[PDB]
Design an enzyme around this catalytic site. Structure first.
Site, short mmCIF file in Angstrom:
data_model
loop_
_atom_site.label_atom_id
_atom_site.label_comp_id
_atom_site.label_asym_id
_atom_site.label_seq_id
_atom_site.Cartn_x
_atom_site.Cartn_y
_atom_site.Cartn_z
N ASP A 282 -0.58 -7.55 1.82
CA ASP A 282 -0.09 -6.08 1.84
C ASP A 282 1.68 -6.10 2.18
O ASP A 282 2.17 -6.08 3.25
CB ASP A 282 -0.60 -5.41 2.99
N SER B 23 3.91 2.42 8.26
CA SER B 23 3.65 1.32 7.39
C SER B 23 4.64 0.71 6.70
O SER B 23 5.34 1.57 6.24
CB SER B 23 2.66 1.80 6.48
N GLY B 24 4.77 -0.46 6.23
CA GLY B 24 5.93 -0.88 5.76
C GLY B 24 7.07 -1.42 6.50
O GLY B 24 7.72 -2.37 6.21
N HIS C 117 0.76 -1.27 0.07
CA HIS C 117 -0.12 -0.10 0.13
C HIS C 117 0.86 1.26 0.20
O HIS C 117 0.35 2.36 -0.02
CB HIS C 117 -0.98 0.00 1.32
N1 LIG Z 1 -2.62 2.16 14.37
C1 LIG Z 1 -2.21 1.33 13.56
N2 LIG Z 1 -2.01 -0.01 13.82
C2 LIG Z 1 -1.53 1.37 12.32
C3 LIG Z 1 -2.20 2.75 11.65
C4 LIG Z 1 -1.85 2.94 10.47
C5 LIG Z 1 -2.20 4.20 9.71
C6 LIG Z 1 -1.69 4.03 8.47
C7 LIG Z 1 -1.65 4.92 7.50
C8 LIG Z 1 -2.39 5.96 7.47
C9 LIG Z 1 -2.67 6.96 6.31
C10 LIG Z 1 -1.96 6.54 5.21
C11 LIG Z 1 -0.85 5.39 4.92
C12 LIG Z 1 -0.11 5.55 4.01
C13 LIG Z 1 -0.83 5.50 2.71
C14 LIG Z 1 -0.04 5.44 1.43
C15 LIG Z 1 1.29 5.37 1.66
C16 LIG Z 1 2.23 5.39 2.76
C17 LIG Z 1 1.10 5.27 4.02
C18 LIG Z 1 -0.79 4.65 6.12
O1 LIG Z 1 -0.13 3.62 6.14
N3 LIG Z 1 -0.90 2.86 8.60
C19 LIG Z 1 -1.02 2.20 9.61
C20 LIG Z 1 -0.33 1.04 10.08
C21 LIG Z 1 -0.74 0.88 11.61
CL1 LIG Z 1 -0.04 -0.90 11.92
#
Ligand SMILES: NC(=[NH2+])c1cc2cc(-c3cccc(-c4ccccc4)c3O)[nH]c2cc1Cl
Lengths: 110, 248
Positions: free
Chosen positions: B88, B184-185, B41
């Site tokens: 993902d 993320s990632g 993502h």
């Molecule tokens: N609270 C959690 N456990 C959590 C929250 C988020 C929130 C995100 C996130 C929110 C908005 C945009 C991106 C995003 C979208 C595109 C590229 C990069 C990041 C996110 O990864 N990723 C997450 C991963 C986790 Cl475990």
């Protein structure tokens, strides 16, 4: 808890657990050594084997193993796990495989 | 990372930052000097011009002048990532390899058959927000969270049946410590001594959650053990590839 496939940090020889013995056995050298070194490294969670070589029990020693395992080369390319294509054998040449897998998961600071 | 602490150089040498046109978007983990494992993502339609991506490594401060920044040659993402949340995961091939030093090291993968230990406490690191309506961290943060079982996470009070089998939750029922936007990632790593040496392995990839650090809304990670073969394949298959490719 020990994983059934191990590699030595002294000479990279591969050791596979023989549950009917409770001992580790060496992997007899074969023409498929590269695929076996690659598969053994993946199995253990390393990404790849960087290189592998062939040791000689007579110049390297056994280092606490009991026997050899041989790989069924014709089945070898259908496998995902090493333990399903290996069998006890005599390994008359007394030459086994050593694998240098990519190192990972360790910090290198003092 | 919400509820974490600033960490130091060389502690989590596999952590990298993926920046698009100057902004840090995702985290990633080095599998070798030229391959990084992250989440699919992170490369939506509008962020697919490889020339605009850089991978920063070897520093815990986003503005360190002593870290390295390399380009990206290709991105291989999982064809089962329907959105383009299961599958993902993606691999990023750098244009040239990073040197491996005491500050840049690859992390290990789970061994075959190695399963997750529910309840075990692992670490998650990143530069994402330290509060949902907060800002990203300037220094890499680290936090310890336990693996939650699926029976509990899929309960109607947590994520009521949205946790599919190749993902898992980690966190505190109470909330407080969690990953967030920008993490993320990145890496979710656990340490073990099954290879007779303690090694840290990549057990999860930070993927999603509802808000951040809320009680009963833990973080959801991609379960790496279920993609081992996809990763081995991809890397052999696309070593000389350039572009955005998908592998199933
Ligand atoms: N609270 C959690 N456990 C959590 C929250 C988020 C929130 C995100 C996130 C929110 C908005 C945009 C991106 C995003 C979208 C595109 C590229 C990069 C990041 C996110 O990864 N990723 C997450 C991963 C986790 Cl475990």
């Amino acid at each position: 808890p020990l994983y059934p496939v191990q590699v030595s940090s002294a000479d990279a020889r591969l050791m596979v657990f023989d549950k009917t013995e409770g001992t580790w056995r060496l992997l007899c050298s074969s023409r498929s050594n590269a695929r076996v070194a690659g598969l053994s490294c993946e199995e253990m969670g390393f990404l790849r084997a960087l290189t592998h070589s062939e040791l000689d029990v007579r110049t390297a020693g056994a280092a606490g193993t009991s026997g050899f395992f041989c790989v069924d080369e014709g089945r070898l390319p259908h496998t995902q796990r090493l333990l399903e294509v290996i069998s006890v054998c005599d390994c008359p040449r007394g030459r086994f495989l050593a694998a240098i897998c990519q190192d990972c998961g360790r910090r290198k600071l003092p | 990372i919400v509820g974490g602490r600033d960490t130091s150089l060389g502690r989590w040498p596999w952590q990298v930052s993926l920046r698009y046109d100057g902004a840090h978007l995702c985290g990633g983990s080095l599998l070798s000097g030229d391959w990084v494992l992250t989440a699919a993502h992170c490369f939506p339609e509008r962020n697919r011009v490889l020339s605009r991506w850089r991978v920063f490594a070897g520093a815990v401060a986003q503005a360190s002048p002593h870290g390295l920044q390399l380009g990206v040659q290709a991105v291989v993402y999982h064809g089962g990532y329907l959105p383009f949340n299961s599958n993902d995961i993606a691999l990023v091939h750098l244009s040239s390899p990073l040197p491996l030093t005491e500050y840049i090291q690859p992390v290990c993968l789970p061994a075959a058959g190695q399963a997750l230990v529910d309840g075990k406490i692992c670490t998650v690191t990143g530069w994402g927000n330290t509060q949902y309506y907060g800002q990203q961290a300037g220094v890499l943060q680290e936090a310890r969270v336990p693996i939650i079982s699926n029976d509990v996470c899929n309960g109607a009070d947590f994520y009521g049946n949205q946790i599919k089998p190749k993902m898992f939750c980690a966190g505190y029922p109470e909330g407080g410590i969690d990953a967030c936007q920008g993490d993320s990632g990145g890496p979710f790593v656990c340490e073990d001594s099954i290879s007779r040496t303690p090694r840290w392995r990549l057990c999860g990839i930070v993927s999603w959650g509802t808000g951040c650090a809320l009680a009963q809304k833990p973080g959801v990670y991609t379960k790496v053990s279920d993609f081992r073969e996809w990763i081995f394949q991809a890397i052999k298959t696309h070593s000389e590839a350039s572009g955005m490719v998908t592998q199933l």
